[PDB]
Design a binder for this molecule. Structure first.
Ligand SMILES: Nc1nc2c(ncn2[C@@H]2O[C@H](COP(=O)(O)OP(=O)(O)OP(=O)(O)O)C[C@H]2O)c(=O)[nH]1
Ligand SMILES: [Ca+2]
Ligand SMILES: [Ca+2]
Length: 1203
RNA sequence: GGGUCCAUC
RNA sequence: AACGAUGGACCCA
């Protein structure tokens, strides 16, 4: 020991101060029980003195109302855990009561009346408690709402009853309005705001009263939103609170809402790197299949878990070997991931969301203090989250020179433990110190070894997935002539062997059957094992007897249920979730392994509203059974959006939309807007007029107008719209205009490759004299290409990227384009392509067959603009299959040149930058890919690659003429690698051009033929391009001036100047809606109209059937309704707290799919996968359904918010 | 992913 | 009867 202190428990059994603040203030009181008590009193304020050195951004809010007088209280602390703590409740419940009767309002007044009790309950807790700010409200008939400790509100009404103020209090808590009336806002806070914004807009170049009226209508909205009056009522958002009051002859005298920790900052805590630095000072001085075990540290702010995780890392490293911010360490036998539990709600969230499943907690308590009040709450979190085991580390024992005392604290913890139904008598308790273990001290050092030994020993090994009873969530069901019925999915757990009997359980009466077989794409199989994608064949059962959503389990293993208790987390706005609260009758979709299912919920007693971000518990009853174990995770969904995650707790026992409306809308949708003349042109012209420009004299001027590249941005913007707007209209009368043009272009590119092909195979200028930029970039580019690409397309590469995709082939018309049809119907293939097919056919047991063997593709024509079509070519099915393989690998390799062909947004932003700085150029080639000759590829690519390109292309073309071409270009548009090959060729040359000029290659950025490099490089790029057989399009290439374009964004001195196109004769209401919405999005700034354009919009909105004039959707939801305000939409039905708007959809009819083909396509897909708050992964990917568009329109109801 | 629709290369 | 690619919305689930 050190001193004579064996019954200090009496000194602590009334102070809860500590075994080293009791054993200590007792050696300076010579042993006087009632004497020490006082030495600690007046000394307990000096600990609370350095206490205020800890940011305390958690706590509670409280509210009290004297039938007519109300008060709202805010009392802070450091963590969730103390805020739920019984003692912290009593202090602030008193400071609340004793602020109601003694009506206080002066904050620092109620503070000092509660300072000596504040140090009595701050020495006992160990956290900076501090009554932050109080306030109070008085009114005629006032009311309050509170959810949990986090948000409290006081509302003052007049002419309102009990419910009304309750509801308005709830709304105030959900929508936090800064003001009661729009008219309240500082009549000069907005004055400066309208004066700053008025210029911002005047800058675009828009005339006084344009920026004026926009800024006005803007700010009219800005205010209504931050104001009770002009906020859509939370319990029926179709009307505002403003309107809600007026129907009850009521008014709000005012309101107050505090939120715990508002305005604090609370510096973020990164635990994972926390230990890195903690270990920093100390950093100086097959068996890849170990079980992974999840542990977490939990305890008082800094009893030392702070440092103990460090100590575990060092000491475990020093001795043995070496997601979401987690330390991890190793044991001779196991692997551990370790998380800190800094907060109760923070943790419960991660446990539901599945971001932190704990196999065992380690509860850290420093013996210097012993257990604390809030340690009750730490063990309680463990109880509530169901952590199976808790191990205890007694920390800071170096500062306890009396072992008799350790046994005292160890005994307390053993008792709190048992109070919460944990095995307190039998739980491992290590007595040690991390303080002196990370700093090398063999004594306290092996104590960490002792604890680790208990992670290995006491926390049992987590059951391996392969060890659990078999289960496969069913994704799809297939009838296969001769084979029988087969289900596909990923085996979730266990093994299934052929012959074994299986149960199929879920949506309908559970059935049984027997596993005939197991197969993948390549092999056929004896068993399917956990984590494997397979199809499983069944005996007897029919395809119509099975359903996606069911599972396939070892019989009896799992049962179907409909009702259950869960822990769910509702996502916040900032997490892509709901942005509005729900209430009693929430009715969403519950997504289980692989399917959505409907269900109603019941909230617990005393909760009436859930807001985004909430950790609600709820009882969910489903519309029909589905197989569920205990601890099954699900997603909460609203029409495809995930708005919540949940896990099932205890499985229980079990026990409006508009049809004429939809009909009215459908008849409306299938009507034809009927007008005299060219309606598109009338619209374009009325718009030109409303902006003060001359209209289009004739159909001919629509396609032959040139913009001026000067003027204010405002004037260029409309001027450029005029130039572009009608430029792709497919329905002009006057024009000897045909696809004859496309074919001439197409013939012209070929002739051009003929020349370049001749010229480029003759790199001999009759002598070793003359040097050229062209020859030089090719040599330079070649060498770079070879380093990026290899000598040849890897095997892995091909097997990772070949696949079928999409539309027509030489053998299939568009209506048979689905991949499953490419596997069913036999595909054509090229003589040189044949060996690829054979190698494919050698890799599976499935039938891979060839309709024909032939060197032709089909040159056809597609729409492009008012002056010309585009000739493309339809490939042979199997050549495609292989063309996408190389296309996919070039796509990967290009990432190393910082070229990212999945993201056109890089080119858009660099085009924007370019128009501001003039340092970047946007370049365009005249017939990009048709001009890429065989000769150019041959001396740019490794031989290996060139050969494979030559196998895979189609060498000849059959034109609609009946006539032929033998391809001079390397490949036509339609070929599955043309786009990635042109991207490569273009980048390589441009990059080489950068070098030859001492520019940085990384300034080169390419998407197809959309090229961006530094402006300086352009004249040289132009020359290299000329040399290799390209023609740069001067008209669409910009190395100077205010203007840039890349990937469909157009900028002028930095302003978005992108236009919209009217492409077709407008004839259906959906046509007109498209046009009106495109006008909307072009002339609207954040919902606010440019008035010049609004006048045109309103005039043509009148041509729609009336109901369609008012059927509005928000932006971001397609074009089956007009974009506008969904809160005004008379057709919007709210069902179970979710909004549904009806939209026009193309009316379809179901078709029959090819069963063997669809099966094949499924398996082939799963083969592809294998070889290549964060819970988007609770979902799958879907079956194959075929359909045909009739030409009619349907009306579909869809969920939408305002996100 | 596949379709439909919207931008695009 | 219209090819290949990207991103978005709905729908497929
Ligand atoms: N298969 C296919 N490829 C396309 C299509 N549009 C563009 N591309 C690819 O993007 C590049 C060309 O874009 P565009 O600029 O519109 O066509 P272009 O052939 O170069 O002719 P131009 O500049 O004169 O209009 C090359 C081409 O492979 C298309 O509709 N289908
Ligand atoms: Ca081009
Ligand atoms: Ca371009």
């Amino acid at each position: 020991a050190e001193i004579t202190a064996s019954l200090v428990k009496e000194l602590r059994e009334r102070t809860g101060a500590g075994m080293m603040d009791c054993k200590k203030a007792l050696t300076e009181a010579n042993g006087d029980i009632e004497l020490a008590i006082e030495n600690m009193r007046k000394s307990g304020a000096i600990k609370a003195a350095k206490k205020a050195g800890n940011v305390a951004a958690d706590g509670v809010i409280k509210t009290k109302i004297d039938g007519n007088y109300g008060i709202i209280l805010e009392v802070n602390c450091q963590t969730d855990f103390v805020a739920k703590d019984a003692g912290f409740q009593a202090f602030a419940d008193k400071v609340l009561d004793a602020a109601v009767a003694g009506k206080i309002t002066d904050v620092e007044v109620l503070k000092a009346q509660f300072e000596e009790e504040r140090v009595a309950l701050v020495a006992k807790i160990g956290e900076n408690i501090n009554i932050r700010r109080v306030a109070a409200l008085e009114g005629d008939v006032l009311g309050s709402y509170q959810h949990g400790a986090r948000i409290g509100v006081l509302v003052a009404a007049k002419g309102a009853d009990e419910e009304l103020v309750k509801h308005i209090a709830m709304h105030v808590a959900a929508s936090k309005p800064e003001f009661i009336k729009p008219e309240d806002v500082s009549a000069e806070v907005v004055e400066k705001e309208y004066q700053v914004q008025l210029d911002i807009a005047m800058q675009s170049g828009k005339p006084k009263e344009i920026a004026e009226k926009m800024v006005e209508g803007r700010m009219k909205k800005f205010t209504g939103e931050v104001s009770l009056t002009g906020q859509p009522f939370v319990m029926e958002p179709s009307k505002t609170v403003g309107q809600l009051l007026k129907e009850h002859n009521a008014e709000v005298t005012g309101f107050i809402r505090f939120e715990v920790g508002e305005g604090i900052e609370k510096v973020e805590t990164d635990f994972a790197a926390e230990v890195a630095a903690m270990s920093k000072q100390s950093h100086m001085s097959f068996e890849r299949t170990k079980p992974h075990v999840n542990v977490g540290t939990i305890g008082h702010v800094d009893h030392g878990k702070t440092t103990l995780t460090a100590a575990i890392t060092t000491v475990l490293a020093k001795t043995y070997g070496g997601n979401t911010s987690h330390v991890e360490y190793d044991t001779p036998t196991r692997h551990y991931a370790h998380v800190d539990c800094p907060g109760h709600a923070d943790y419960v969230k991660n446990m539901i969301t599945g971001a932190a499943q704990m196999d065992g907690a380690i509860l850290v308590v420093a013996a210097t203090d012993g257990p604390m009040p809030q340690t009750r709450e730490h063990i309680l979190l463990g109880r509530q989250v169901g952590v199976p085991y808790i191990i205890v580390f007694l920390n800071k024992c170096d500062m306890v020179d009396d072992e008799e005392l350790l046994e005292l604290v160890e005994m307390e913890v053993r008792e709190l433990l048992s109070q919460y139904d944990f095995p307190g008598d039998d739980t491992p308790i290590v007595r040690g110190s991390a303080l002196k273990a990370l700093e090398g001290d063999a004594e306290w050092e092996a104590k960490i070894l002792e604890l680790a030994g208990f992670l290995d020993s006491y926390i049992p090994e987590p059951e391996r997935a392969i060890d659990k009873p078999f289960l496969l969530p069913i994704e799809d069901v297939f009838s296969i002539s001769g084979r029988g019925t087969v289900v596909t999915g990923r085996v979730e757990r266990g093994i299934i062997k052929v012959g074994e009997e299986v149960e199929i359980v879920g949506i309908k009466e559970t059935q049984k059957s027997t596993c005939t077989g197991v197969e993948m794409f390549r092999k056929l199989l004896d068993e399917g094992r956990a984590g494997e994608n397979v199809g499983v064949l069944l005996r007897g059962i029919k395809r119509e007897e099975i359903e996606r959503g069911q599972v396939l389990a070892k019989p009896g293993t799992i049962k179907p249920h409909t009702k259950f208790e869960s822990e769910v987390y509702i996502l916040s706005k900032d997490e892509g979730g709901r942005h509005t609260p729900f209430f009693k009758g929430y009715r969403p979709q519950f997504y289980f392994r692989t399917t959505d299912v409907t269900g109603t919920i019941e909230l617990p007693e005393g909760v009436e509203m859930v807001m985004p971000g909430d950790n609600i518990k709820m009882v969910v009853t489903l519309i029909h059974p589905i197989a569920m174990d205990d601890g099954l995770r699900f997603a909460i969904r609203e029409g495809g959006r995930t708005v919540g995650a949940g896990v099932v707790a205890k499985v229980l026992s079990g026990a409006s939309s508009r049809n004429s409306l939809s009909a009215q809308l459908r008849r409306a949708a299938n009507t034809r807007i009927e007008v005299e003349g060219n309606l598109a042109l009338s619209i374009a012209n009325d718009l030109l007029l409303a902006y003060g420009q001359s209209p289009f004299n004739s159909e001919a001027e629509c396609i032959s107008f040139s913009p001026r590249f000067d003027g204010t941005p405002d004037d260029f913007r409309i001027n450029y719209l005029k130039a572009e707007i009608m430029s792709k209209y497919d329905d002009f009368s006057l024009g000897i205009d045909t696809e004859a043009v496309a074919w001439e272009k197409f013939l012209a590119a070929e002739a051009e490759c003929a020349l370049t092909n001749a010229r480029l195979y003759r790199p001999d200028y009759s002598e070793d004299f003359n040097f050229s930029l062209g020859e030089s970039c090719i040599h330079m580019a070649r060498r770079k290409i070879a380093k990026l690409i290899g000598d040849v397309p890897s095997v892995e590469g091909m097997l990772r990227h070949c696949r079928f995709s999409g539309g027509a082939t030489t053998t299939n018309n568009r209506s048979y384009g689905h991949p499953s049809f490419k596997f069913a119907l036999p595909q054509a293939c090229t003589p040189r392509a044949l060996k690829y097919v054979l190698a494919l056919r050698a890799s599976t047991h499935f039938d891979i067959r060839i309709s024909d063997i032939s060197p032709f593709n089909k040159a056809v024509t597609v729409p492009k603009n008012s002056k010309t079509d585009r000739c493309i070519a339809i490939e042979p099915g199997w050549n495609m299959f292989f063309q996408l393989g190389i296309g996919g690998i070039l796509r990967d390799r290009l990432r190393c040149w910082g070229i990212d062909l999945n993201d056109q947004t890089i080119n858009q932003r660099r085009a924007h930058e370019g128009s501001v700085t003039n340092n970047l150029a946007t370049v365009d080639l005249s017939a990009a890919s048709d001009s890429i000759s065989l000769a150019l590829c041959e001396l740019l690519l490794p031989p290996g690659w060139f050969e494979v390109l030559m196998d895979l292309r189609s060498p000849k073309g059959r034109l609609p003429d009946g006539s032929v071409v033998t391809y001079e270009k390397i490949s036509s548009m339609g070929n599955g690698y043309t786009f990635e090959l042109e991207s490569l060729i273009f980048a390589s040359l441009a990059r080489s051009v950068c070098e030859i000029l001492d520019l940085d290659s990384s300034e080169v950025t390419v998407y197809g033929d959309d090229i961006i490099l530094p402006s300086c490089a352009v004249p040289a790029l132009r020359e290299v391009f000329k040399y290799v057989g390209f023609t740069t399009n001067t008209k669409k290439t910009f190395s100077e001036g205010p203007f840039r374009e890349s990937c469909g964004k157009h900028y002028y001195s930095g302003v978005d100047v992108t236009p919209f196109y009217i492409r077709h004769r407008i004839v259906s209401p959906a046509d007109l809606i498209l046009v009106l919405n495109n006008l909307y999005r072009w002339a609207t700034i954040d919902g606010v109209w440019d008035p010049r354009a609004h006048s045109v919009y309103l005039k043509y909105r009148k041509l729609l059937p009336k109901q369609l004039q008012r059927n509005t959707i928000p932006d971001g939801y397609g074009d089956g309704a007009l974009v506008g305000s969904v809160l005004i939409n008379p057709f919007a039905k709210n069902r179970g707290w979710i909004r549904y708007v009806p939209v026009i959809t193309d009316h379809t009819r179901d078709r029959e799919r090819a069963e063997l083909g669809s099966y094949l396509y499924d398996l082939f897909s799963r083969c592809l996968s294998e070889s290549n708050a964060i819970d988007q992964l609770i979902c799958r990917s879907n079956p194959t359904k075929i359909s045909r568009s009739t030409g009619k329109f349907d009306i579909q109801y869809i969920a939408c918010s305002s996100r």
